[PDB]
Point group: D5
Chain length 184, copies 10
Amino acid sequence: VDLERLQALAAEWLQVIGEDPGREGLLKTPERVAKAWAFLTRGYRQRLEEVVGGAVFPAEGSEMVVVKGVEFYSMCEHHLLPFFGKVHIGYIPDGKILGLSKFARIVDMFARRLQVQERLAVQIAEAIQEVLEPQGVGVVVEGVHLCMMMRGVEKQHSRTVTSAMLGVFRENQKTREEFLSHLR
Amino acid sequence: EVDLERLQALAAEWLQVIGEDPGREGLLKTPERVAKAWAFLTRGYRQRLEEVVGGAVFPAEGSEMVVVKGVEFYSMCEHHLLPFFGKVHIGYIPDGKILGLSKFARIVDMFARRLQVQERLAVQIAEAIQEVLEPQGVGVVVEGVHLCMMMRGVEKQHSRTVTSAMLGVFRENQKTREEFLSHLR
Amino acid sequence: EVDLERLQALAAEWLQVIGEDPGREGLLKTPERVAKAWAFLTRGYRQRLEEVVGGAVFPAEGSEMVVVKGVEFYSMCEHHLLPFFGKVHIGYIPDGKILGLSKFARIVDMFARRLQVQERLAVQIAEAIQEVLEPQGVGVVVEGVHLCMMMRGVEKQHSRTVTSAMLGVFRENQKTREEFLSHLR
Amino acid sequence: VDLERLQALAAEWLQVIGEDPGREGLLKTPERVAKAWAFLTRGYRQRLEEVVGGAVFPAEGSEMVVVKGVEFYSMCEHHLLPFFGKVHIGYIPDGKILGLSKFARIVDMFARRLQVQERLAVQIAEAIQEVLEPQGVGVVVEGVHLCMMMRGVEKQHSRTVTSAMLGVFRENQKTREEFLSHLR
Amino acid sequence: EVDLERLQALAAEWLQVIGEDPGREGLLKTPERVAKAWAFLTRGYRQRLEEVVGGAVFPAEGSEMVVVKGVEFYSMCEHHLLPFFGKVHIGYIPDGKILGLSKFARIVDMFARRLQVQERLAVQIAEAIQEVLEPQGVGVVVEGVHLCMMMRGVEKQHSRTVTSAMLGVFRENQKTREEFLSHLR
Amino acid sequence: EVDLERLQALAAEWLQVIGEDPGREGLLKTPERVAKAWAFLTRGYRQRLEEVVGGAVFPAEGSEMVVVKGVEFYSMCEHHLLPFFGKVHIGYIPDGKILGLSKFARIVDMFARRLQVQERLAVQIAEAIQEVLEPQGVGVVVEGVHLCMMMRGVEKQHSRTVTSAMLGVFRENQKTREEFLSHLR
Amino acid sequence: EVDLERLQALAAEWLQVIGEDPGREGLLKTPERVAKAWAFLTRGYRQRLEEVVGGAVFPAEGSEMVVVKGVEFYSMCEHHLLPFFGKVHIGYIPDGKILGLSKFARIVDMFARRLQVQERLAVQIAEAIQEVLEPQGVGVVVEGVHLCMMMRGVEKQHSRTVTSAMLGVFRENQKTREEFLSHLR
Amino acid sequence: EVDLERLQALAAEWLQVIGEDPGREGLLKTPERVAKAWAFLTRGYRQRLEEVVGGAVFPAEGSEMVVVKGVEFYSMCEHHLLPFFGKVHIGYIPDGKILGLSKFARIVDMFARRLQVQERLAVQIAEAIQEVLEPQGVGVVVEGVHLCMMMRGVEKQHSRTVTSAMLGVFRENQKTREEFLSHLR
Amino acid sequence: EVDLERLQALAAEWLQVIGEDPGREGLLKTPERVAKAWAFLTRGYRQRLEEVVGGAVFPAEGSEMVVVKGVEFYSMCEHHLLPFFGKVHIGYIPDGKILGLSKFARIVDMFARRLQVQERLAVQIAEAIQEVLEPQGVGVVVEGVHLCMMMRGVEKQHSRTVTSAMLGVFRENQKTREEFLSHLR
Amino acid sequence: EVDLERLQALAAEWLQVIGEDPGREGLLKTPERVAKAWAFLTRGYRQRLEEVVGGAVFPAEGSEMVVVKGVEFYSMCEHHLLPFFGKVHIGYIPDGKILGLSKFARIVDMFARRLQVQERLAVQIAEAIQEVLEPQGVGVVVEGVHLCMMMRGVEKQHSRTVTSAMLGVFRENQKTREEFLSHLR
Ligand SMILES: Nc1nc2c([nH]c(=O)n2[C@H]2C[C@H](O)[C@@H](COP(=O)(O)OP(=O)(O)OP(=O)(O)O)O2)c(=O)[nH]1
Ligand SMILES: Nc1nc2c([nH]c(=O)n2[C@H]2C[C@H](O)[C@@H](COP(=O)(O)OP(=O)(O)OP(=O)(O)O)O2)c(=O)[nH]1
Ligand SMILES: Nc1nc2c([nH]c(=O)n2[C@H]2C[C@H](O)[C@@H](COP(=O)(O)OP(=O)(O)OP(=O)(O)O)O2)c(=O)[nH]1
Ligand SMILES: Nc1nc2c([nH]c(=O)n2[C@H]2C[C@H](O)[C@@H](COP(=O)(O)OP(=O)(O)OP(=O)(O)O)O2)c(=O)[nH]1
Ligand SMILES: Nc1nc2c([nH]c(=O)n2[C@H]2C[C@H](O)[C@@H](COP(=O)(O)OP(=O)(O)OP(=O)(O)O)O2)c(=O)[nH]1
Ligand SMILES: Nc1nc2c([nH]c(=O)n2[C@H]2C[C@H](O)[C@@H](COP(=O)(O)OP(=O)(O)OP(=O)(O)O)O2)c(=O)[nH]1
Ligand SMILES: [Zn+2]
Ligand SMILES: [Zn+2]
Ligand SMILES: [Zn+2]
Ligand SMILES: [Zn+2]
Ligand SMILES: [Zn+2]
Ligand SMILES: [Zn+2]
Ligand SMILES: [Zn+2]
Ligand SMILES: [Zn+2]
């Protein structure tokens, strides 16, 4: 990402909205905004194999593993405004388990992009599927969208839930229900 | 369009009939304020579903249920012309198309900003979504408090009412319905 | 019509027998206050379901369940003449007819303002709704605390009692009943 | 209040906003609206002496009596939309105490009118002052305003607090603080 | 002490006057149950403070105030003969003497099990503690809900009343009173 | 007025610089959406305090403090152009004039819909109220979360920031300030 | 029955063996207080189910489940003679006969005021109810905290134990047991 | 020290006197378990303050108050030999020396594992800290629930007792004590 | 068992390498404290299940499942040697044998006080219970937070992990497992 | 720079001494993981306040207090090398200069990622802010839980520790300090 070009675009953005890039509080803003966006879009430049590293261990049992409450932050591709919340992951191993923290690294890889909450859930689930080839995986994303809160409809109490169910989580109703019950 | 002038005249007369003084300082601008307020509160009748959606329909990203919960709403009961309000929870399973999240709120407001009965509000919201997306199914749950039950009449204070509408797979598939409802708990 | 004069006489003698002084400043108007209170607390026996509903029956807007929860109630246990209170939750599936929301509260009060047993209260409310709407089904859940268990006798403080009545589809369809009960959680 | 005239005004109101007074759901609406408004404005027609009745008893002590959480419902005189919440009352007797329920009857007398929350607090306090002539009285009104929530600014998390302090509640900082602390 | 036979006869007639049938299966033993209940509910009039304390007064261990909060109480309002209940919080600074913790509850019950006014209940509890022990000060706060305000009359649901009595240093020193009250929040 | 066309051009270029495809289906309308969003998010610069208040200033009804709490707000930090949001609490003591409650919210939005620093937001809101009402004093407390601290950089998740501005009696009278702040707890 | 004198002597020797001074001011009346205490805490062994229930068995008002939850209880573990306490929840479906609500609490106390094992407590309570009402089924859930594992031994602080007993339809019917357990949630 | 054999014999006789069978399966090892239990529960009498604190006295890092709250504790009332438990909160201002955090808990256990009176427990803990650190002042607040008044006697369920001890600046300085107590809120 | 002298030497050097001064007043006894701590934290490797249970296996009292929830645990992740902690919930259906409640906690500590992976911890606890008792089934749920995820690396703050192991009927019958899991919500 | 190679060697030997197998699959990369973790956990010693602040000091917008609360932190106790964590709350009154909000979090981390005692942590954070801004005053409150008290030693579970540092007006002005502390409640 060309930080220098982002800075120039940000400086002009400030002017067009009626601000003064030369005033003290905005002097380093174009630079700060440029670096922030490089970080906020770093997900596009990451590789799944590197993100997981080699933290795949032999399964200790056959029961479902649930990693809940993984906070996430993303940007809606429609308004370029933040949407955030939590991601809950559940899976039944097929001989291999993932290092707990790698789930969060996978979440960040797909969240630090321009997104659609519906896509985010699917991409996370598919990534875990590719890495562990488990019997099944289930991912639930619950978030609040600033594009709905600070502008437009300006609704304050809303939150959205999206999910993706693969393998036995899609095929076995009881398995899915058990996973969702753990989140309640 | 609503005749604001007539509304102002009616409101001015309303004030005198209830025993107030339409001429006192604090009520002078009231007929005007009330007229504008009611035009806004009934603006939903004059809206078009096509314009409300604004073509914000996108290709589905997956096959799982999408649940948009806690969309606050405010309406007026057609029986007493007193506000009833709370939240609307929407759930649906796409059939190739998903809706921009905010459009669910815009649809809610379109049907809430009218004289209503909560049972109908749920149905109309669900039917609007079904028409716009033609999803596999849609479920709408409305939960609200009614001032006509709280500030007068029975004057109950702890009551809330839940109404809903289930279409397609939400009406036919028991487990799909149970799954949607469980997300709300 | 209750004989208020006779109630006052009985209450005045009650004050004497329990050891109090009916002549006290603070007790002078007590017999009169007690008479009026009990006339109100037992007014349910003198009400008619037809008048309580007031013809507030409208055409159904859909086929989904309507749940009116948290209708607070107050009653008197027929065993000790001590209050028991809490909330009544009502669920039903219409068969072409829906009831004005407040009428559920009026029906609750009609049966609550009598001497009762909680098990009966749930049943009578459910049967009343059934008679008025002839719905596909109706379910009533009553949850309350009993002062006769709290301020005397066993003197338990944390206990609460749940009673219910299920009619039509609420009794015949397992999933329907579960759906109603889940809405209460 | 002329219920018949209110009904006629309500029937026309329905027509002007684009509705049909003849449809089933609105048949009895003009009548219902008329009766509701007669009840909602009944406060103007009540008398303080009748509302209190004669429920004024000899004081049992000198300490502050606090009656909190008296729910209330009113109508803003500006938009004719409901504003509601709770009223908390505190006072130090001067030989006379009021029957607890009469505080609620006084609240209703002033709430069932077209109001301004700032006025409501003062009128309730002054009424209690006139009835008991206590050493002091304090009234706090906290409410939510539908004219701010369902229209206009459409803010959802706001609530307003107004109050009135008379006698020792105005003069004695510690007395006022003690009353307000009881509400926390 | 109290004539249970006269109470039973009064209760049996009470059932008749309010519109009930004393012959009903559910009301057969009611007059008897009601008489015994009221005998228990007014037992406080016949209790002696010296016996209530049972000589459970021990030497002080320190100078700091002792706070016994959350002592649940149940009483009857002398105006309507309907229950009012809640909690009693007690704070005191000893002067060489401390009371057995449970004795505070026994004192509460002694005064609560009578016909009362919440303002008096607080004063009588504090005065009793002041008599038994000879503390530097005593503070009693009573917070309760009144059924005469909830199940009839104004029918307000969210209200509760706080009454108190401050003696000795609790009345004298504002900082002591403030500290006692802060412990309750 | 804001040049939407230039904003769209800048946004379109922004998308390509960050590595995205401005031509893909979901991003086609993005430059347009972003342009309109930012014009709205910075609309506060173009508003006039006189028009915002709309002459909704009324005669004071009393002398006590008025507290309008929980007015939600959303702003953009001038340092990172990322949202910071939360609530604004306002307190003031009238000097002959009170403000229409909703105008407090309109004033908040006027200063929040700009590039800001939370410390300034509190001050400007307080100064605006002081100018419009010339009250005895005014206090404004802003509490918010900052996404620039949450979704990047230090990435702290539990932090909230409180800023305030106290004018007149709120700045000078300790007890008046304490009273205002206590209402917020 | 229980030889109080013998218990006092045993308690007196207990005080000296553990290292305390039986002649100390605060311990003089201890052996006496402990004796009466344990007589009360073991009174359940001497009670009779017939007397505890009395004649409080009324005709069933309906066929739906009756749930009496939150009946607090206190018992002593037979293994350490240390208290274990919590709540007992009872559910049952009548077969023509319903029990007076307070009798459930009296039955709980009858089996709780003994040396116990929580697994047994739930079973005995269920059997007692089954014997008295002969209902279609009974379900008992006991949830408590044990001081023997909190104030000594493992010294775990967050643990709670749930034991239960299901008879009749509560053991047979899966849906019935589920419905009962759901009411407790 | 404690003669475990003698306690076992006493516990064995206790079991038969109360009406139980000492030869019963679940009671065979009870007298042994009870003996060791009470030895542990009274171990505080045999501990030495110097050994409990060890050498964990470090140089003060500053002059501000240090507050260690929520230290759970369990003790036995000397009057009934029944447990009373809750939490101990400690606050102090150092005078050049600070204590290792865990030592506060060890001091609490030292005085808690004895036969006690809650008023004394707070005093002893405060004195111990004062003796070990000689700080500018120490404040101790003990809040607990007593089973002797919950599972027997008055059988009150919602009550909690607070006792405290203030030494040095915590007793002298009004603001210091207030600040400490505010931290607990 | 473990060489405390070697651990001390390793810890002393650890302090030096990370940039600290072992000679500092605050670090003088650290190597010693760290060695003893790790000896305690790995004590589970040297424990014997038979001794942990202490023959506390009693005859079953009923057939219903016993649920021991909220057993707090603390462990160290074998990957980073950083603590992970939370609670362990255990459910089982006996087959003539029930375990002493506290023994479940002792089994938890036996396996937690080792280097672990949460997935294994759940399995080992369940297998131990399955060996000691010969139940029809056992279910163990472990829920914990991991410092290696919170204080370093991804630094996520809101996450917690659930692992479990189901044996016997808990694995076989879905309704049994579901009932166990429902008791935890 | 820390010698990661040496840390790995020490960690590998640590695994051997505690009784584990360094050759295990799950422990092969542990020495490397532990080395990197500790380098990060002690990175605070290698940071410079000037670089941490990054010149993010701006002109003050007003004279009122700025409170940044809930900044979560994680540290290692210098006594046992076990984590202690919680939150840091910062308050200050500017003297012409304000700090970028995130810098407070960066300052917290600089001092937290070291071996510490909570009393020192509060002081160093406060002194750092003082040096950077030279404000009229600054106050820092640190509230945390210590694993060395929870997972070993006394094993207390409910305890939490509060430490603080007050400089300038926060130390000199009683009301200012109270105002800051009240914002934290
Ligand atoms: N399904 C879905 N829709 C989203 C997400 N993020 C997001 O902005 N949207 C929707 C919100 C809007 O309805 C839609 C864009 O609507 P639009 O093209 O008419 O633009 P707009 O800004 O004028 O819409 P609006 O927010 O004012 O209603 O994109 C997301 O993650 N999932
Ligand atoms: N089902 C349903 N009923 C409603 C709604 N809003 C609303 O006012 N109602 C009911 C409440 C009342 O029972 C009914 C009108 O009853 P009614 O014609 O006898 O008039 P009323 O004002 O005298 O009745 P009440 O409120 O005093 O009981 O309309 C709604 O959204 N759904
Ligand atoms: N102080 C005070 N103001 C009130 C109360 N009720 C109430 O509506 N107001 C205010 C809200 C509005 O700001 C004001 C009327 O404003 P306005 O004459 O400009 O009319 P408007 O409807 O266009 O105002 P707005 O609500 O859209 O902002 O009356 C109340 O109880 N106290
Ligand atoms: N101060 C005080 N007043 C009480 C208590 N209990 C109690 O009923 N009262 C009041 C409530 C009533 O206002 C009053 C009796 O009022 P009243 O003689 O007019 O009788 P009422 O039944 O018609 O009054 P109301 O409840 O319908 O308002 O007694 C109490 O403990 N303290
Ligand atoms: N006082 C104050 N500071 C603010 C506000 N909004 C906001 O971003 N800041 C601070 C956060 C940062 O510390 C600072 C910008 O720091 P900087 O110029 O070093 O830029 P940076 O992005 O590299 O800083 P950082 O967030 O990564 O720590 O602006 C606000 O409303 N008030
Ligand atoms: N499944 C599972 N994984 C665990 C546990 N404890 C624990 O540290 N892990 C994982 C977290 C990490 O992803 C993994 C070690 O990852 P790694 O070998 O790449 O080392 P790292 O420190 O660089 O990884 P990271 O935490 O920075 O992501 O071990 C546990 O109890 N269960
Ligand atoms: Zn968007
Ligand atoms: Zn209505
Ligand atoms: Zn208004
Ligand atoms: Zn009364
Ligand atoms: Zn920023
Ligand atoms: Zn035990
Ligand atoms: Zn005792
Ligand atoms: Zn780890």
